[PDB]
């Protein structure tokens, strides 16, 4: 037992992290086969980042302007090209540590592991969810750009996120590995607002199931509710509407615990309307929404990767 | 900005994890140079674990009873010996992935990263603190024994924890890498109680400093308090007494924020006596105590490892 916010083991990604320096900008790149991916705002100066035209900026660059360091070994850039908001630097060596991988774009509500990195050196690993407003609540300082987010499914790393920037609220924005931003953001140093967030309803329910699996049962009840009447409570507390496919994906957890999905909704309704009254659930005094049904089933069952 | 519970990158440890099977017990071992370390209760049967005499049990074992698998490659056991509650299995290959390492015993209040492992395959990574009662609030299922806990300081892995067992409250107990248990526990399947816990006071204060660094300031005040009068509040709420060395270690954080340590204690006092009134601190509705002053300074400054 126990329930922790748990990231994937990071080793396979650590082996791909490199340092990319252009001019007076240094950030991280991701080295897979003979390509290094990194955020395109590395080509910019401090007064370039204020309103840049990246095509104009990149045609003035050459291969030798890109210093790529795989630890203490310099990689030679032999080509460069821009794909949306990422740069693809072709180097003269293939990464011998290249894992089996995919580039996948995730849905809001889904989770991933972030390997925070500085100067090409991994610093820490933690779990994040893609918020409904396409931001992520991360931990990122100067020089963390190009750190990636990922999931691991057996031996294959599915990269879903590259870090680009921090919004004024202290949340973080970035792209998939094809360089397309999550959300209505641009890699420009001007004011941009995140869009109003919501709580990920199906994730809260999954976490309640994790709690029951772990022996927290004080919030259970013999009441029930229709899906329709749950959602009138949901909109009232800025929770996402629940769909029948969310009920279906909660099916296995419903089955293991013997608590019908709609019964657990009645419990969530009561927690929303009354609060917790000085109690906790899995060591939290808040309703937690950054665990997916998948996350619960992995941790409360025990899947591995090789 | 941002503040996350952040583990060390796990790659260096992933390369040391192996599967150890004896009889009908399988668990994880830690493979460093030509030795595999694992919990000694692997030699036991189901009715051995109820009241075992381990010296008697081990003299009846031989090298060939220990099946060690480094992935899909079998390691050959050429010696075995018992050091307290761990076994040391000498194998015929040195691990070529052996990091620079140390075996260190940590103090309650200190934190470390756990690489949860099943069948020799790493499953996830997360952060833990050693509770004042020498337990840890982990996430561990059947077969997770032998997963280790560690810190990383530049290139050197300091191993501090090996997992052995789960107490009836759902907390976890284990040993340092010399096989000496943390706390008054034995590797015996009988009832054992954890001892009463306390909150790690200096850690809460460090986390309040992390919050200020990140822009949560609503709990600040212009009141102050003497160290003496803070501790009368501390014992009242089951918090650890604060010492002058805790004030000293909080010095740098005190300096960056400009909030005197004793001023922050006055704030903690008020949070203890009034609660939070529907507000959060760094996304938590509870006072968090599993971040050390070191943890705050790493995350709010950005140290790496290579
Ligand atoms: C790249 O490592 C860096 C990572 C930032 C620094 C602090 N925390 C982070 O996540 N990104 C940038 O510096 C980013 C590039 C310049 C300005 N950038 C910012 O993130 C800005 N943020 C904004 O100007 C506001 C948003 C809407 C852009 C700050 C945090 C440095 C002020 C690019 C080209 C956007
Ligand atoms: C080893 O992988 C396993 C890990 C446990 C299983 C569930 N969660 C864990 O952390 N350890 C053991 O099975 C452990 C060995 C036998 C009994 N063990 C237990 O942890 C017991 N716990 C107790 O009997 C109570 C404590 C005081 C020992 C349970 C959880 C399996 C009932 C050893 C020799 C103690």
From Swiss-Prot, chains A, B:
Residue ranges annotated as Cytoplasmic topological domain: 1-306
Compartment(s) of residence: Host cytoplasm; Host Golgi apparatus; Host nucleus
Ranges of residues in domain Peptidase C30: 1-306
Record's signal peptide: none
Activity control mechanisms: Inhibited by pyridone-containing alpha-ketoamides compounds 13a and 13b. In turn, alpha-ketoamide 13b (tert-butyl (1-((S)-1-(((S)-4-(benzylamino)-3,4-dioxo-1-((S)-2-oxopyrrolidin-3-yl)butan-2-yl)amino)-3-cyclopropyl-1-oxopropan-2-yl)-2-oxo-1,2-dihydropyridin-3-yl)carbamate) inhibits SARS-CoV-2 replication in human lung cells. Inhibited ex vivo by michael acceptor inhibitor N3. Inhibited ex vivo by compound 11a and 11b.
Catalytic reaction list: TSAVLQ-|-SGFRK-NH2 and SGVTFQ-|-GKFKK the two peptides corresponding to the two self-cleavage sites of the SARS 3C-like proteinase are the two most reactive peptide substrates. The enzyme exhibits a strong preference for substrates containing Gln at P1 position and Leu at P2 position
UniProt-annotated catalytic positions: 41 (for 3cl-pro activity), 145 (nucleophile)
Cross-link Glycyl lysine isopeptide (Lys-Gly) (interchain with G-Cter in ubiquitin): where in chain: 5, 90
Subunit structure: 3CL-PRO exists as monomer and homodimer. Only the homodimer shows catalytic activity. Interacts with host FBXO22; this interaction promotes the proteasomal degradation of nsp5.
Function: Cleaves the C-terminus of replicase polyprotein at 11 sites. Recognizes substrates containing the core sequence [ILMVF]-Q-|-[SGACN]. Cleaves and inactivates human TRMT1, preventing tRNA guanine(26)-dimethylation of tRNAs. May cleave human NLRP1 in lung epithelial cells, thereby activating the NLRP1 inflammasome pathway. May cleave human GSDMD, triggering alternative GSDME-mediated epithelial cell death upon activation of the NLRP1 inflammasome, which may enhance the release interleukins 1B, 6, 16 and 18. Also able to bind an ADP-ribose-1''-phosphate (ADRP).
The protein's name in its UniProt record: 3C-like proteinase nsp5
Organism: Severe acute respiratory syndrome coronavirus 2
Gene this protein is translated from: rep
């Amino acid at each position: 037992s126990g329930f922790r916010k748990m990231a994937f083991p990071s080793g396979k990604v650590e082996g791909c992290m490199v340092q990319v320096t252009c001019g007076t900008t240094t950030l991280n790149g991701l080295w897979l086969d003979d390509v290094v991916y990194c955020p395109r705002h590395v080509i910019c100066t401090s007064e370039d980042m204020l309103n840049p035209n990246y095509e104009d900026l990149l045609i003035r660059k050459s291969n030798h302007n890109f210093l790529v360091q795989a630890g203490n070994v310099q990689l030679r850039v032999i080509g460069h090209s821009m794909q949306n908001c990422v740069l693809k630097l072709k180097v003269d060596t293939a990464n011998p540590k290249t894992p089996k991988y995919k580039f996948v774009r995730i849905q809001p509500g889904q989770t991933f592991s972030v390997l925070a990195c500085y100067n090409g050196s991994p610093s820490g690993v933690y779990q994040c969810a893609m918020r409904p407003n396409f931001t992520i609540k991360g931990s990122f300082l100067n020089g963390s750009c190009g750190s990636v987010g990922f999931n691991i499914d057996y031996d294959c790393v599915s990269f879903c996120y590259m870090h680009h920037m921090e919004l004024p609220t202290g949340v973080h924005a970035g792209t998939d590995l094809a360089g397309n931003f999550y959300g209505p953001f641009v890699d420009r140093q001007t004011a941009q607002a995140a869009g109003t967030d919501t709580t990920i309803t199906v994730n809260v329910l999954a976490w309640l199931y994790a709690a029951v699996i772990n022996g927290d049962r004080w919030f259970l009840n013999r009441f029930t509710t229709t899906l329709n009447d749950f959602n009138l409570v949901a909109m009232k507390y800025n929770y996402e509407p629940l769909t029948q496919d969310h009920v279906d994906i909660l099916g296995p957890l419903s089955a293991q615990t013997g608590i019908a999905v709609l019964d657990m909704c009645a419990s969530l309704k009561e927690l929303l309307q009354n609060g917790m009254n000085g109690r906790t659930i899995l060591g939290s005094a808040l309703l937690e929404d950054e665990f997916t049904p998948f996350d619960v089933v992995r941790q409360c069952s025990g899947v591995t990767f090789q």
